């Protein structure tokens, strides 16, 4: 009934809030930090890769009310490519930032050699390129096959017809949710287990609650990663085994499922650039 025009406001509120936050973060990086250290390079990377995917969000909104993809073929390939490109870029920037913090804490001697502001930009270009190397096999098969009546936006496969696209969901699951969770929970847990054995943070109650603050921030980033990208991967796996009965209460929760898939992109400004000390200067 009247949910099809009301869901768009609460579904593009994620677009508005995340776009405002990511533009705020990339603006304060480009206007107050000048990309001088290694950390602001990764923060600007995550802000840009979240901003582009967040600006993409209204394009998926018309695919419920209008029913179609009313953008023609001149946008379907491009939008699918930048969606499946900036998703992997926002994942791999978090992975590279986690590996950077793990090297900076757990291996302090080698961290002076590695994380110079030249190598941080080099591994940044490396993970953008590695995201392209799996986003372009998405892009070359991002066709447009018309329905009963609409214009659509979907991905058919090569030969074989129905399996070689079925590899893509499993690949995005095992290479975009299993590997980043399995890297940023261990890559941060060994950092926490190292910081509990640091004389700078062990005793001395004020410094003990500073250690508590660091562990709260690490649990917040890992828990918001899992809480955001649990349903959009669990549902896309369950949509492959069983054909879900088309209950009219499903699809509002599935656009909400896409919305909390992009809530990580929305809240990485609130997660990183607000909850540091670089915002104070």
């Amino acid at each position: 009934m009247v949910t099809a025009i009301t869901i768009m406001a609460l579904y593009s509120i994620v677009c508005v809030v995340g776009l405002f936050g990511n533009f705020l973060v990339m603006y304060v990086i480009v206007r107050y930090t000048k990309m001088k250290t290694a950390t602001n390079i990764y923060i600007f990377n995550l802000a840009l890769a979240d901003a582009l995917a967040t600006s993409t969000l209204p394009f998926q909104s018309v695919n419920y009310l209008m029913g179609t993809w009313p953008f023609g073929n001149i946008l379907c390939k491009i939008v699918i490519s930048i969606d499946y490109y900036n998703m992997f870029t926002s994942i791999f920037t978090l992975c590279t930032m986690s590996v950077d913090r793990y090297i900076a804490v757990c291996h302090p001697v080698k961290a002076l050699d590695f994380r110079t502001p030249r190598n941080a930009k080099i591994v940044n270009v490396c993970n953008w390129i590695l995201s392209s190397a799996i986003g372009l096999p998405v892009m070359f098969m991002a066709t447009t096959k018309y329905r009963q009546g609409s214009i659509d936006c979907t991905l058919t496969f090569s030969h074989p017809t129905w399996y070689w696209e079925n590899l893509l969901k499993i690949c995005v699951f095992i290479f975009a949710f299993i590997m980043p969770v399995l890297i940023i929970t261990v890559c941060y847990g060994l950092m926490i287990l190292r910081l509990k054995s640091v004389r700078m943070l062990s005793g001395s109650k004020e410094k003990d609650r500073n250690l508590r603050r660091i562990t709260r921030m690490v649990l917040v980033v890992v828990a918001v990663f899992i809480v955001c990208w649990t349903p959009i991967h669990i549902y896309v796996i369950i949509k492959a085994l069983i054909t879900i009965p088309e209950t009219t209460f499903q699809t509002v929760s599935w656009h909400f499922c896409i919305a909390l898939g992009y809530t990580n992109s929305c809240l990485n400004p609130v997660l990183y650039a607000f909850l540091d000390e670089n915002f104070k200067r």
Binding site: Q60, N63, D83, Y84, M87, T154, I258
Partner: peptide, 5 residues
Amino acid sequence: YXGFX
């Protein structure tokens, strides 16, 4: 993700 398909 999720959308398109």
